[PDB]
Amino acid sequence: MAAYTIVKEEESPIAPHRLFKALVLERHQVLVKAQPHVFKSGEIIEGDGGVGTVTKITFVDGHPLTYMLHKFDEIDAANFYCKYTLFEGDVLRDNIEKVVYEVKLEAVGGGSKGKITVTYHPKPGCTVNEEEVKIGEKKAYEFYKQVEEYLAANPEVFA
Amino acid sequence: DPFTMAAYTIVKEEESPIAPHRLFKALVLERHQVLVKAQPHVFKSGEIIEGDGGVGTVTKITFVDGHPLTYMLHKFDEIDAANFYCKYTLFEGDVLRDNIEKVVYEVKLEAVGGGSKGKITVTYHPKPGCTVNEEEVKIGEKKAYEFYKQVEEYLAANPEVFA
Amino acid sequence: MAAYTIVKEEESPIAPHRLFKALVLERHQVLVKAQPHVFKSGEIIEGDGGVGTVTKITFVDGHPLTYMLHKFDEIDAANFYCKYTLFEGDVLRDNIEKVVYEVKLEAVGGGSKGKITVTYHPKPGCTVNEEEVKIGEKKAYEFYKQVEEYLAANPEVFA
Amino acid sequence: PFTMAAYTIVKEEESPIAPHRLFKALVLERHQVLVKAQPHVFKSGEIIEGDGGVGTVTKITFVDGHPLTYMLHKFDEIDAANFYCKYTLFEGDVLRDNIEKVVYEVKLEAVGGGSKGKITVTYHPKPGCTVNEEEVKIGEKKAYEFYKQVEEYLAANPEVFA
Amino acid sequence: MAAYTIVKEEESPIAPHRLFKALVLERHQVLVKAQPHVFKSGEIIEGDGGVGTVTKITFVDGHPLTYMLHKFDEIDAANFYCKYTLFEGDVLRDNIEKVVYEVKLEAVGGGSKGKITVTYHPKPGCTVNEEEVKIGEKKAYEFYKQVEEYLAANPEVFA
Amino acid sequence: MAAYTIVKEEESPIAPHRLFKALVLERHQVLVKAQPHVFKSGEIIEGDGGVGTVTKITFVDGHPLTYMLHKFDEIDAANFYCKYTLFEGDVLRDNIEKVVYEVKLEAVGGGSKGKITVTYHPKPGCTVNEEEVKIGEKKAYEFYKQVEEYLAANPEVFA
Amino acid sequence: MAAYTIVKEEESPIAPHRLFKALVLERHQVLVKAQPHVFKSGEIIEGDGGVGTVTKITFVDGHPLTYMLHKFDEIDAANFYCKYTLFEGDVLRDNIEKVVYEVKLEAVGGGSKGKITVTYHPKPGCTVNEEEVKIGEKKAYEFYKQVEEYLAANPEVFA
Numbered sequence A, C, E, F, G: 001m002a003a004y005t006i007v008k009e010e011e012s013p014i015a016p017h018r019l020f021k022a023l024v025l026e027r028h029q030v031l032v033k034a035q036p037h038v039f040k041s042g043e044i045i046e047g048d049g050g051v052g053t054v055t056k057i058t059f060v061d062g063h064p065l066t067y068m069l070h071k072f073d074e075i076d077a078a079n080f081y082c083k084y085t086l087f088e089g090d091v092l093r094d095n096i097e098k099v100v101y102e103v104k105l106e107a108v109g110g111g112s113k114g115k116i117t118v119t120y121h122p123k124p125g126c127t128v129n130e131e132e133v134k135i136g137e138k139k140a141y142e143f144y145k146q147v148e149e150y151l152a153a154n155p156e157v158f159a
Numbered sequence B: 001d002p003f004t005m006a007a008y009t010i011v012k013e014e015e016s017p018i019a020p021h022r023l024f025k026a027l028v029l030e031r032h033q034v035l036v037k038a039q040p041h042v043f044k045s046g047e048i049i050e051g052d053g054g055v056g057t058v059t060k061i062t063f064v065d066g067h068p069l070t071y072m073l074h075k076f077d078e079i080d081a082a083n084f085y086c087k088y089t090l091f092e093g094d095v096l097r098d099n100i101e102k103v104v105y106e107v108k109l110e111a112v113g114g115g116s117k118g119k120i121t122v123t124y125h126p127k128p129g130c131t132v133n134e135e136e137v138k139i140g141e142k143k144a145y146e147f148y149k150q151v152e153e154y155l156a157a158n159p160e161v162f163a
Numbered sequence D: 001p002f003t004m005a006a007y008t009i010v011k012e013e014e015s016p017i018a019p020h021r022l023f024k025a026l027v028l029e030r031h032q033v034l035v036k037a038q039p040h041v042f043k044s045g046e047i048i049e050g051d052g053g054v055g056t057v058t059k060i061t062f063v064d065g066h067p068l069t070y071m072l073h074k075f076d077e078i079d080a081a082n083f084y085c086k087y088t089l090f091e092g093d094v095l096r097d098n099i100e101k102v103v104y105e106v107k108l109e110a111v112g113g114g115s116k117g118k119i120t121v122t123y124h125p126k127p128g129c130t131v132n133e134e135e136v137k138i139g140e141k142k143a144y145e146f147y148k149q150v151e152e153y154l155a156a157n158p159e160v161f162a
């Protein structure tokens, strides 16, 4: 059970409830707001917006990837806590079974602090892509920095 | 030590939809300014005379002229703006009514959902061998809660006001 | 202290996801479509429909009553299980601190079955009689009925 | 309608005894030090819950002839390292019907081969009834005399807790 | 950047509050009781059972490895959760920066459920020895049991 | 022109007033108690023990070195700070006018943390034999460690 | 690891409530005032004009370096005592990690005298180049010399 893991910490001028709404609860929608050139649509197909909720993110028709689904494992918007899981979608490929994210945020001034952890759950006797991992933190970190900048400059959004 | 003069302490537990950073700011840091903005008929101005809006800072809160009162003097004893903590003391001004040595405000807030949780604890300190009026206490808490409640509605209404 | 406990076991032709949506998850917004001659507005004042959510139902201007705020406690919608708190509002008389409903449905063929466990808790400052505890029941029994008629005649709603 | 009162006493103190010493005697081991200093007033004292850390509770018992009989205490916050503690006298016959509980905050600091302390004690009234100086001064003088007693033995014995 | 993670779930017949005191809280001393042949000492350098506790170990002089050092990130003693990291040691080979221990137990019947995660963080540039992984599990597992049975055979131990 | 100052930070189980006394105030007398094969005598030749005080420390006979004189420039015992300086002796070779010593200690639990800064000042138109600094620290640290162990065993010395 | 230390005692007719501000508190805006050709911009991007603040001086298009960042380990704007650290920026050659500047201004009638301790601290095994010290000591003394003029020139400013 060899699972590669990236546990990191970040810090923002953006407020923590706001950033959470943007990067966790509303992520499926916000992905399409920040990258209309990559994602055609983002929805919920199962759940009411809390634990057990299932989203469907669809790439534009010209993108190599097709779609992904994530499920909400635990959510406690009270203390900016959620653990979700990417359990279906081409990006996974054949070597990976599901990618699990666990996010913890907290206010530090008018801004935030967060502990983000990614763990890749490989299929029986497969090699987790070390490269797939660099691509993972890459795609997100950009997204997170891209959102942070919209928000900074549009303070009424999710405020 | 025949006695260590007894002091009067109120411990409050309060909650807002306002995010702890907007409130730490509106009612602690820029309070001096937000009072006059919120209640421009009672206070002409608030202005930091000493320090640079940080620890050991002291402000002068000024009432109108016709108003019984004139100026209030607050000193900043402890701050951790990151964690929304503050000790700030009231010492120079006639709001005491020539009997209280000082009033000790201790404040701690924390985020919840889209809002705040709040630790407030007021302590009234008299000058040598004087009584600590229940009266002033009734009023020290009542004017501030009203104050607080006005500034909440503002910030709920105007959602970009504090940063 | 001690409280009055109404416990029940009702049965319905409507499927349980249709009732759970109509009478638990969207109750607040459904009380106004059905009793627009009583209620002006229903709304979540805070929450993601999760567990710490709070809704607000407002009575019409003339109505002797003014408002109620309900705050979910824990949910399992998939299973149609919900415990939800009536913590404040004009409706609570001085004798009542809160009223706790415990909802759990199951399927019965093309219909449903459900047990309800409504509890009136008082304030130390007063005691609980039966006239009021009997009214709550009527209000809420009569509501469902009005809704059953509706979920039966329009099968598209929350199906 | 208003927030209930409670009475606080702030003290600032200075000792020529090293501070880790007095943190052991009047705080971490108050329950055992109280009997050694005052076997005349106390029969025993001891722990009943925990192993010294946050949440730890202790029990105090006065001889069979004393008009008081026992006292309970819970440790709210311990940061021994900087000599800060917050504990609560929450149960025993010492709480005259008006008193609900007594909260004690203590911070100590090094000053040469001795120390400086700031002690704050907060009495909390129970619904309806009111607190008064009675319980307080008596409470103030009991704690102080004990400590002086501590101070004179800790000095008279350099290696004890040193 | 990427770490080797080990997620483990087993479950043992002992009340959580009893394993907890042995396999983690006092795991310094009871590690000798367990192996008075591989283990020389069990010590708590600092921490009064306080989070941020750091222990000190040393195998018998014969053993090639000198000692092991742990800090306790957090301990929910009341809740039977603990996070601890192996931060220094001869056992901590020159290619591993730290090995993190995430353990959470809870009562199940008259037994326990064991899920624990250990993460292997490699010192900058190194791949980390996949040997130290297989090894890590076997050694702290074999010891898992010893301590189970013993505690099983004495119901008065840490009651 | 610029001198060499080595900024150190250390930790002792001993209390700061103990460290400070032993390693600073009666240091001239302890060096002989701890190292009577190295040293013959410690004394004060120009001072009362207050600021601007001078000690005279002779090395046993048949020893390379002959003696050393230090002056106590700043003394704030209350906060455990000191500024003293070696300015005379064959131990200071041809180069360096004066290596300066600055000790700042703090209480912590049953012990103490320290901050020490040695500032080696080159001799008029010279370089600093940065190999005499390597030599200076060692002996001063052993002296220390010997004193540490000595004070721990006998907890009545500098109480 | 050794460090390079500067003991410089200066003088100046110009009043210290102006130099101190210029030379320390508003140095970031004034560097950029005395040498527009060396720097195009300089600002405070963190902290709030007090101990713990961080500055960003931005060298012009035509410079090897483009920016450096300073931190105020300590401020005392009434006794004219400061202690700020150069933590980040290109100027720090692989062998230098930070420079610690301790300044103290005293009042000599209508002017000042001073003591500046500049201490360059090396990274893990690396050592500072004699070069690295005279450079820093000079463009800075030079800067000071232009301001002695600037100010004296016009008592209007900083008075």
Ligand SMILES: O=S(=O)(O)c1cccc2cccc(Nc3ccccc3)c12
Pocket: A022, A030, A033, A034, A146, A147, A150, A151, A157
């Ligand atoms: O404004 S929102 O959609 O709320 C929004 C919310 C959060 C992040 C966003 C990033 C980019 C663009 C947005 N809006 C946008 C505006 C114009 C065109 C396309 C997107 C973002």
Ligand SMILES: O=S(=O)(O)c1cccc2cccc(Nc3ccccc3)c12
Pocket: A045, A046, A047, A048, A051, A052, A053, C017, C018, C020, C021, C076, C077, C078, C158, C159
């Ligand atoms: O799935 S939904 O599409 O919202 C859905 C649609 C219509 C009625 C539903 C009733 C109960 C639970 C649902 N979902 C749900 C999903 C996950 C967890 C808990 C409840 C219902």
Ligand SMILES: O=S(=O)(O)c1cccc2cccc(Nc3ccccc3)c12
Pocket: A134, A137, A138, A139, A141, A142, A145
């Ligand atoms: O550069 S950033 O957006 O800052 C970026 C910031 C921080 C971390 C990053 C990690 C991986 C990839 C990026 N790639 C990337 C790739 C293409 C465009 C933009 C970014 C990261």
Ligand SMILES: O=S(=O)(O)c1cccc2cccc(Nc3ccccc3)c12
Pocket: A135, A138
């Ligand atoms: O592009 S960024 O992450 O901004 C980037 C920034 C700085 C250094 C990089 C080194 C390798 C790969 C990158 N990116 C990358 C992006 C996509 C696929 C593969 C590699 C680097």
Ligand SMILES: O=S(=O)(O)c1cccc2cccc(Nc3ccccc3)c12
Pocket: A038, A065, A086, A091, A099, A132, A135, A136, A139, A140, A143
């Ligand atoms: O969901 S995110 O990573 O945030 C994401 C953010 C932005 C762009 C993305 C594009 C492709 C795949 C994603 N997910 C993905 C997940 C795991 C592995 C590889 C790609 C993207």
Ligand SMILES: O=S(=O)(O)c1cccc2cccc(Nc3ccccc3)c12
Pocket: A009, A010, A011, A012, A019, A020, A023, A024, A101, A103, A105, A112, A113, A114, A115, A116, A137, A140, A141, A144, A145
């Ligand atoms: O950007 S990442 O860490 O890659 C990221 C990856 C996946 C989910 C995330 C959710 C919330 C915030 C993020 N970042 C974040 C950054 C700064 C502060 C707080 C959170 C998330």
Ligand SMILES: O=S(=O)(O)c1cccc2cccc(Nc3ccccc3)c12
Pocket: A145
């Ligand atoms: O953010 S950084 O942490 O520096 C960072 C981390 C990792 C990779 C990065 C690649 C490009 C730019 C960065 N910075 C960046 C910063 C803000 C906006 C866009 C890119 C990268």
Ligand SMILES: O=S(=O)(O)c1cccc2cccc(Nc3ccccc3)c12
Pocket: B026, B034, B037, B038, B150, B151, B154, B161
């Ligand atoms: O807008 S005001 O009417 O003054 C106002 C009225 C009442 C309460 C206020 C509280 C905070 C900030 C305000 N204004 C504000 C204005 C500019 C900058 C920052 C705050 C408040």
Ligand SMILES: O=S(=O)(O)c1cccc2cccc(Nc3ccccc3)c12
Pocket: B012, B014, B015, B016, B023, B027, B028, B105, B107, B109, B116, B117, B118, B119, B120, B141, B144, B145, B147, B148, B149
């Ligand atoms: O409680 S108030 O009386 O308004 C109050 C009185 C005095 C000082 C206060 C400082 C901060 C916040 C307050 N209120 C507060 C309320 C809710 C949450 C957080 C703080 C203060």
Ligand SMILES: O=S(=O)(O)c1cccc2cccc(Nc3ccccc3)c12
Pocket: B042, B139, B143
């Ligand atoms: O007196 S208090 O309400 O405490 C009070 C406190 C502080 C400022 C006040 C300003 C105007 C009127 C008040 N009260 C008031 C009282 C009686 C008649 C009319 C007005 C003020």
Ligand SMILES: O=S(=O)(O)c1cccc2cccc(Nc3ccccc3)c12
Pocket: B042, B095, B096, B103, B136, B137, B139, B140, B141, B143, B144, B147
């Ligand atoms: O309480 S304050 O928030 O500073 C405050 C807030 C708003 C209005 C006030 C009016 C008068 C006196 C104050 N202080 C005060 C303090 C102690 C006793 C009596 C009045 C007022």
Ligand SMILES: O=S(=O)(O)c1cccc2cccc(Nc3ccccc3)c12
Pocket: B138, B139, B141, B142, B143, B145, B146, D001, D002
């Ligand atoms: O009682 S207080 O808690 O102060 C109080 C606090 C906050 C708001 C108040 C509003 C109206 C009356 C109060 N009572 C009141 C009573 C007598 C005179 C004036 C106001 C309010």
Ligand SMILES: O=S(=O)(O)c1cccc2cccc(Nc3ccccc3)c12
Pocket: C022, C030, C033, C034, C146, C147, C150, C151, C157, C158
């Ligand atoms: O439609 S209404 O005429 O408002 C309506 C009228 C009367 C009773 C109703 C009961 C349940 C749902 C309704 N409507 C509804 C409509 C859309 C979605 C969910 C419920 C009811």
Ligand SMILES: O=S(=O)(O)c1cccc2cccc(Nc3ccccc3)c12
Pocket: A017, A018, A020, A021, A076, A077, A078, A158, A159, B112, B113, B114, B115, C045, C046, C047, C048, C050, C051, C052, C053, C054
């Ligand atoms: O307060 S809300 O207005 O929804 C809100 C608004 C914006 C961002 C939020 C982030 C987390 C939790 C919320 N609310 C929440 C409320 C109750 C329980 C749990 C979370 C957020």
Ligand SMILES: O=S(=O)(O)c1cccc2cccc(Nc3ccccc3)c12
Pocket: C031, C038, C065, C091, C099, C132, C135, C136, C137, C139, C140, C143
């Ligand atoms: O029962 S509810 O279902 O919320 C309800 C449903 C429909 C109509 C109602 C009208 C008034 C009060 C309610 N609540 C209420 C609560 C307790 C006692 C009496 C009435 C109503």
Ligand SMILES: O=S(=O)(O)c1cccc2cccc(Nc3ccccc3)c12
Pocket: C137, C138, C139, C141, C142, C145
């Ligand atoms: O109002 S009465 O019918 O008189 C009434 C009287 C007595 C008990 C009742 C209980 C539930 C509902 C009522 N009304 C109701 C109305 C329509 C449908 C179902 C029940 C009750």
